[PDB]
Amino acid sequence: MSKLEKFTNCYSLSKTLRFKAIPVGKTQENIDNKRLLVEDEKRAEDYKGVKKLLDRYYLSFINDVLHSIKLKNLNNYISLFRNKELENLEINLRKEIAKAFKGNEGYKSLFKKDIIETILPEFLDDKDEIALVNSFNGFTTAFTGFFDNRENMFSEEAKSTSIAFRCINENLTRYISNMDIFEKVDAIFDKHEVQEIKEKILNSDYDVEDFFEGEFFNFVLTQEGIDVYNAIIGGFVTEKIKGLNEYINLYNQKTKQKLPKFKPLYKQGYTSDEEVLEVFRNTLNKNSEIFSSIKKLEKLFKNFDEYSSAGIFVKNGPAISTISKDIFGEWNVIRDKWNAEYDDIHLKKKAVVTEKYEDDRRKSFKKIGSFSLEQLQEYADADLSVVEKLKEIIIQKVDEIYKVYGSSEKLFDADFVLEKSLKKNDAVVAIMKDLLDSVKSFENYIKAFFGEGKETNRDESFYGDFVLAYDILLKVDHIYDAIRNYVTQKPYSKDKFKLYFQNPQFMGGWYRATILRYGSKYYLAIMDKGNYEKIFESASKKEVDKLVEEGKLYMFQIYNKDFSDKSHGTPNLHTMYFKLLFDENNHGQIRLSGGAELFMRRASLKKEELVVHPANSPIANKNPDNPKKTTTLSYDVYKDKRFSEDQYELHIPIAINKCPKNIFKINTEVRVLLKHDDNPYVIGIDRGERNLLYIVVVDGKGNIVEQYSLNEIINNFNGIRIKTDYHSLLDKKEKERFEARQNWTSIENIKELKAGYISQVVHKICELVEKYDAVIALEDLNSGFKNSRVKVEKQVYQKFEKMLIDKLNYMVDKKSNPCATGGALKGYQITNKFESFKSMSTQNGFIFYIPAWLTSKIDPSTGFVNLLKTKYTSIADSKKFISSFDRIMYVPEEDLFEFALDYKNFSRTDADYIKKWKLYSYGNRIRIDWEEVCLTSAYKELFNKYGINYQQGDIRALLCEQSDKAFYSSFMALMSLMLQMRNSITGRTDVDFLISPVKNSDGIFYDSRNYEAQENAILPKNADANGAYNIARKVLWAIGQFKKAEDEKLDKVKIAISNKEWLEYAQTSV
Amino acid sequence: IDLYTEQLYNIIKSLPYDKRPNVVYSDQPLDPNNLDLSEPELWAEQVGECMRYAHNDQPCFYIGSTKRELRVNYIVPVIGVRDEIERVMTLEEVRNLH
RNA sequence: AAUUUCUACUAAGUGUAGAUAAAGU
Ligand SMILES: [Mg+2]
Ligand SMILES: [Mg+2]
């Protein structure tokens, strides 16, 4: 009656097993004597040509349909735009565009065989490229993806890349702002002046004012319309003709007034070190478009005060935190000033600050679009001008850019020659990365001042210039990505091309392809235009080998190192799947669905580059936790031998559980089973600071069943058992990154190492789940933070959660008998399919996502948690603090100091449940540069140093009489480190204990150092065990909630445990 | 020359990876008897693997991790961590390492 | 440092342990 045993055969699943095909007999020379690998390589190289031709025809069709289109909703848009009566109308507009597209009499052909068969061989009419578009005749399937991507532009889903979104959300806004700017900036113009020459040279038929009319936007939908409009905006040679923006610049230089300039509309990998370096020299030299953008933005941001401060803006998000850090001291000052001004309106005279109130305040803030500069000036102090500080920090960033340019004069000079290859040269890559990093830091910084766009009183005099420069500056993103992806590139390559064998309908079923098998060798037989076993009518090996010798057959051997004869360990998972395709115990579980695909990868490593470990020479072993410290093999070990030859990859799809029967909802069955269960286990996983991942398995009553670090993965094999310390490997990689000139390659190596690590942790957690029938407990990554010391960051932890979901969709034990529950044929399906990184929340089958609030800095034996705010600010606040304690006395028996507080008398302490805590000065704390401090001795020292008796009792009144400014500073300092539970020496020394200042019912303070020297411990051994323990106890609370509800209201039980309920549970569970 | 680097290969091939020296790498031959620092191309990093070219059995060294693919042909051990190189070790100060 | 491929290897000597949904954009 176990839980997991009910979650087999739930739903269907699909995978592609990749193998390697080895030509058998004289198949390779029968292929080279028919040249069946040049037609297909030629087709793979002409794919890009036909892609460009199809793009050209698509562009023609787009510019055709965007002429026969006139909207009826645009005048209403312009009339109502210059907050909810407009979005319906604009989606109506985008729907109108998309209907104009999908309503043409030729849209049917755009993504089917007709556009390669009939249309494009006519639209082109060039005997050179009609050859291309006729070569792919019958091979329409080779475009299946391309079309499915080249239609998301003809749609209206308003994603950043679509024609409707471009024309409406990004173009019409600029057109309307241009209408405003033309109505405002006029009469510095004349027909005698440059207006008539503008008209004659660029339009020649109708007036120029017509392009600032409202319903004349249905002319700039076509790229040539955008071109003529942007021409009359900026200036278009036919005789260099000046445009309106430089006529404005000519006016603003005649007399001094910052008059707004128009905004132009939008328009709807490298392969050699020399190409990379010349692209760098071209785009980023000291006279490029980008350096000119930087100079323009410098002159703008240094002329930053002659623009009306009420008009500038700053977007709301990370930009606000960074701006406060750079201006108002540190991270949260703007947020707390806004919170003060929000309490002064939405908070009564009471101290009733509730988590619902705090959450609604946070939501109202996070929904604020952007902050003006006058607002951010009101939040400031006396004699602090926010625009001066912004100007000085931006000018500092620009001067730092110029300095980095001054460190790199040589990569721009024509004399420069490359000594080494780019991937092996790291002085020049250091130069390139430093330049790109400085410029992109500037780009990401000034990205803030584009404050949400949709707002009324934008100072267009500033934003004209700003967007003119920034829309040229943001090409550094693509340049950076291209150069980086070129440098962090493996010396081999995995570029392949599918082989068809003169047959469009090839291998698409079980076609001219079959999977034979003989003994323990599985073969892929492809007919062209002893005894085996067909997949079961037999054959004769003699006559099939005769066919192979003739040429009527192309027998490949499916092979990976588990089909080898020298392989003795456990096979791969997909090898077991394949071998099971043809088994008897396999009824319909893993079946052969779809058609295979025979690719072909050419040799990427030149045999002059192959590097080898010479035979009969002792090789050093890289694993420090290995007993055997060398290895001597009787043969050679080539590095990357697989990429030094041509290889016929073979992709075989399989459909697991094609005909499921135990169909139901997984979440509700999990809830029912956790309810009806009397002792459900829970695996809490947590990201530690000294441990990559930390596991704590807790039974149904809060008792720790197991707790251990996942730093080192332990591989069992042949009965032997060898461990690998991934924390040490990661520390080595981080040290290497610290040593290297540039860290583009080091970062990719670290990322891929972490991906491999989580691929090991996946198996660890699965074998933990199928041992206890447990339920996983994971941090909810949407809400929360890990303070930058946590090794596994959020990206790789998201990848870990995704990998765990994707594994638990079909959990398999490789060692188990296949037909047995948990084996490859009957794996557990205890999780739903992955959907998105945002829907990973609040449940997924056996996985519960839990907020990580108050999990590591909480006493695990009493539930205590430091909800105070013990930071020194002034004499008055500290005096009120000291006077808010119920009692502060020196207990002489224990030689301690009792601070009997009561969280009711303190602000923002509503979550607490046992509101009356009594916390002492027990133990020693490590402050931070670190220093150990014995607390009672520090208190006695401070008291005596400031002239204070303490044997009296209740020395609060004796203590709030000190007139000194530094007494309260020292006092609140060591009062802050007394409530510090998680103590850890910064310099990596593994001392991460966790002491608590309150004593439990039995009268002993929890100290992790009393449990780290133990196996079979009842309380967490360190701070990370505490984190995992609490993340598990939250799911235990949710299980109790399930037990409280009925068997129909289970589906509605909310399990996002709130701080109030969590502290109540943690403080009464004991 | 080649003999110094052949001896260096035979020595460094046997040390455990955590003991390997810090070296200055390049692809044209490096002459420790004459190698002078202060050149803005000498960066002291730590040797990784030590393998042989398959076509002519010339020793090559992977600086840092093998997965980093910074394979060089000529190294020289130094007492240094960064662009701040102190001095050049000898063919016996590298044997003293383990 | 060998791989369908990735990660860590050498793991008892042409491999070991885990993971692996490919194609297309
Ligand atoms: Mg194996
Ligand atoms: Mg490797």
Domain boundaries, chain A: 4-34+499-656, 39-150, 163-254, 273-316+369-487, 681-717+726-856+1029-1068, 875-980
CB pairs under 8 A between A and B: 73
Residue A168 near residue A77, CB atoms below 8 Å: no
Residue A37 near residue A31, CB atoms below 8 Å: yes
Nearest by Cα to A285 from A415, A397, A405:
A405
Per the domain annotation, does B94 fall within a domain? no
Q: At a CB cut-off of 8 Å and minimum separation 6, what does A752 contact?
A: B67
Residue of B nearest to A491 (CA): B69
Amino acid at A850: I
> Strand, helix or coil at A161?
coil
Per the domain annotation, does B95 fall within a domain? no
Resolution of the coordinates in A?
A: 3.0
Nearest by Cα to A995 from A954, A1042, A934, A1052:
A934
Amino acid at A551: G
Strand locations in B1-98 (E): 22-24, 44-53, 59-63, 71-72, 77-80, 85-88
Strand locations in A668-711 (E): 682-686, 694-698, 704-709
Here the tokens at position A72 are: 């009826």
Residue corresponding to tokens 């109708």: A206
Strand locations in A69-181 (E): none
CA dihedral B88, B89, B90, B96 (to 10 degrees): 180
Residue corresponding to tokens 């790291």: A426
Beta bridge partners, A20, equal: A559, A649
Beta strands A847-850 and A776-779 are parallel
Per the domain annotation, does B11 fall within a domain? yes
- Which of A491, A618, A745 comes nearest B14 by C-beta? A618
Here the tokens at position A132 are: 């291309």
Pick the ligand that lies closest to the CA of residue A815.
1
Residue corresponding to tokens 């509309």: A265
Q: How far is A791 from chain B (nearest CA, A)?
A: 20
Instruction: Check whether residue A722 has its CB closer than 7 Å to nucleic acid strand C.
Output: yes
CA atoms within 13 A on the CB side of A965: 2
Q: In whole angstroms, what is the distance from residue A363 CA to residue A361 CA?
A: 5
Report residue B33: phi and psi, to 5°.
-65, -25
Angle at A254 between CA A248 and CA A255, to 5 degrees: 95
H-helix segments, A447-599:
460-473, 476-487, 541-550, 573-581
Across A410-443, b (16+ Cβ under 10 Å) vs e yields: ebbeeeeeeebebbbbbbbbbbbbbbbebbbebb
Pick the ligand that lies closest to the CA of residue A717.
1
Q: In whole angstroms, what is the distance from residue A715 CA to residue A721 CA?
A: 6
DSSP A323-348: HHHHHSSSSSSHHHHHHHHHHHHH--
CB neighbours of residue A455 within 10 Å: 12
B46 close contact with A: CB closer than 8 A: yes
Report residue A843: phi and psi, to 5°.
180, 155
**C-alpha distances in angstroms, A336 versus A70, A448, A754, A953, A1008?**
50, 20, 37, 38, 35
Here the tokens at position A611 are: 């590097």
Q: Which residue, among B11, B13, B26, would best test binding to A if mutated, counting the most A CBs under 10 Å from its CB?
A: B13
Residues of A whose CB is below 8 A from B54: 607, 610-612, 636, 638
Nearest by Cα to B94 from B52, B70, B61:
B61
Residue A845 near residue A667, CB atoms below 8 Å: yes
CB neighbours of residue A607 within 10 Å: 10
A568 Cα: distance to centroid of ligand 1 (angstroms): 8
Give chain A residues 484-543 with Cβ within 7 A of strand C. Answer: 490, 494, 496, 498
Measured from Cα to the C1' atom, the residue closest to C15 is A567
Report residue A629: phi and psi, to 5°.
-95, -5
Q: How far is B14 from chain A (nearest CA, A)?
A: 6
Residue A548 near residue A24, CB atoms below 8 Å: yes
Nearest by Cα to A614 from A640, A638, A581, A582:
A638
Residue corresponding to tokens 């990154």: A737
Nearest by Cα to A562 from A17, A28, A24, A26:
A17
Which structural domain range is residue B70 located in? 2-88
Task: Give helix A726-739 / helix A745-772 axis angle, nearest 10°.
Answer: 170
Query: Nearest nt to A725, CA vs C1'?
Result: C8
> Strand, helix or coil at A630?
strand
- Which of B40, B45, B69 comes nearest A739 by C-beta? B45
Chain CA centroid to CA A471, Å: 25
Measured from Cα to the C1' atom, the residue closest to C12 is A631
Per the domain annotation, does B80 fall within a domain? yes
Technique of determination: cryo-EM
Per the domain annotation, does B98 fall within a domain? no
Strand locations in B6-55 (E): 22-24, 44-53
Q: In whole angstroms, what is the distance from residue B93 CA to residue B97 CA?
A: 7
Q: At a CB cut-off of 8 Å and minimum separation 6, what does A482 contact?
A: A269, A270, A279
Query: Nearest nt to A13, CA vs C1'?
Result: C21
Q: State whether B16 and A629 contact (CB < 8 Å).
A: yes
Here the tokens at position B88 are: 């050049």
Pick the ligand that lies closest to the CA of residue A569.
1
Q: In whole angstroms, what is the distance from residue A45 CA to residue A39 CA?
A: 10
Q: In whole angstroms, what is the distance from residue A770 CA to residue A780 CA?
A: 23
Length of chain A as a residue count: 1070
Nearest by Cα to B54 from A604, A639, A617, A620:
A639
Q: In whole angstroms, what is the distance from residue A986 CA to residue A142 CA?
A: 57
Pick the ligand that lies closest to the CA of residue A564.
1
Task: Give helix A74-81 / helix A173-184 axis angle, nearest 10°.
Answer: 60
Instruction: Check whether residue A598 has its CB closer than 7 Å to nucleic acid strand C.
Output: no
Amino acid at A558: I
Give chain A residues 564-593 with Cβ within 7 A of strand C. Answer: 564-570, 572-575
**C-alpha distances in angstroms, A235 versus A195, A199, A246, A249?**
12, 12, 8, 13
Here the tokens at position A630 are: 């060398």
Q: In whole angstroms, what is the distance from residue A830 CA to residue A836 CA?
A: 18
Interface residue ranges in chain A relative to chain B, Cβ cutoff 8 Å: 420, 423-424, 426-427, 490-491, 607-608, 610-614, 617-618, 620-622, 624, 629-630, 636, 638-639, 733, 736, 739-741, 745-746, 749, 752
Q: State whether A612 and B66 contact (CB < 8 Å).
A: no
Give chain A residues 14-43 with Cβ within 7 A of strand C. Answer: 14-16, 18-20
Q: How many domains does chain B have?
A: 1
Chain CA centroid to CA A948, Å: 56
Angle at A1026 between CA A1022 and CA A1029, to 5 degrees: 135
Residue A765 near residue A781, CB atoms below 8 Å: no
Across A212-235, b (16+ Cβ under 10 Å) vs e yields: beeebbebbbbeebbebbbbbbbb
Q: How far is A799 from chain B (nearest CA, A)?
A: 22
Residue A206 near residue A161, CB atoms below 8 Å: no
- Which of B17, B46, B52 comes nearest A611 by C-beta? B52
Residues of B whose CB is below 8 A from A629: 16
Amino acid at B3: L
B10 close contact with A: CB closer than 8 A: no
Q: In whole angstroms, what is the distance from residue A938 CA to residue A976 CA?
A: 13
Nearest by Cα to A738 from A726, A727, A750:
A750
Nearest by Cα to A266 from A143, A165, A128:
A165
Residue corresponding to tokens 């619902």: A356
Q: In whole angstroms, what is the distance from residue A259 CA to residue A251 CA?
A: 9
Query: Nearest nt to A807, CA vs C1'?
Result: C19
Per the domain annotation, does B25 fall within a domain? yes
Angle at A22 between CA A16 and CA A23, to 5 degrees: 125
Give chain A residues 845-884 with Cβ within 7 A of strand C. Answer: none
Measured from Cα to the C1' atom, the residue closest to C4 is A19
Q: At a CB cut-off of 8 Å and minimum separation 6, what does A311 contact?
A: A372, A373, A457, A458, A459, A460, A461, A462, A463
Strand locations in A519-666 (E): 521-525, 556-559, 590-591, 597-598, 611-613, 619-620, 630-631, 637-638, 648-656
Angle at A813 between CA A812 and CA A817, to 5 degrees: 110
Residue A53 near residue A129, CB atoms below 8 Å: yes
Nearest by Cα to A377 from A445, A305, A443:
A305
Nearest by Cα to A635 from A650, A613, A656, A657:
A613
Please identify among residues 56-75 of chain B the ones whose CB lies closer than 8 Å to any CB of chain A.
57, 60, 64-72
Element (H, E) at A586: none
- Which of B40, B41, B69 comes nearest A490 by C-beta? B69
Q: In whole angstroms, what is the distance from residue A317 CA to residue A133 CA?
A: 49
Nearest by Cα to A598 from A490, A523, A493:
A523
Q: In whole angstroms, what is the distance from residue A804 CA to residue A896 CA?
A: 48
Residue corresponding to tokens 């029967």: A661
CB neighbours of residue A510 within 10 Å: 13
CA atoms within 13 A on the CB side of B46: 18
Helix and strand counts by DSSP (H, E) for chain B = 1, 6
CA dihedral A106, A109, A111, A117 (to 10 degrees): -140
Per the domain annotation, does B33 fall within a domain? yes
Angle at A318 between CA A314 and CA A322, to 5 degrees: 75
Residue A796 near residue A751, CB atoms below 8 Å: yes
Q: How far is A738 from chain B (nearest CA, A)?
A: 9
Nearest by Cα to A615 from A638, A630, A635, A631:
A635
Angle at A544 between CA A540 and CA A547, to 5 degrees: 150
Instruction: Check whether residue A241 has its CB closer than 7 Å to nucleic acid strand C.
Output: no
Per the domain annotation, does B60 fall within a domain? yes
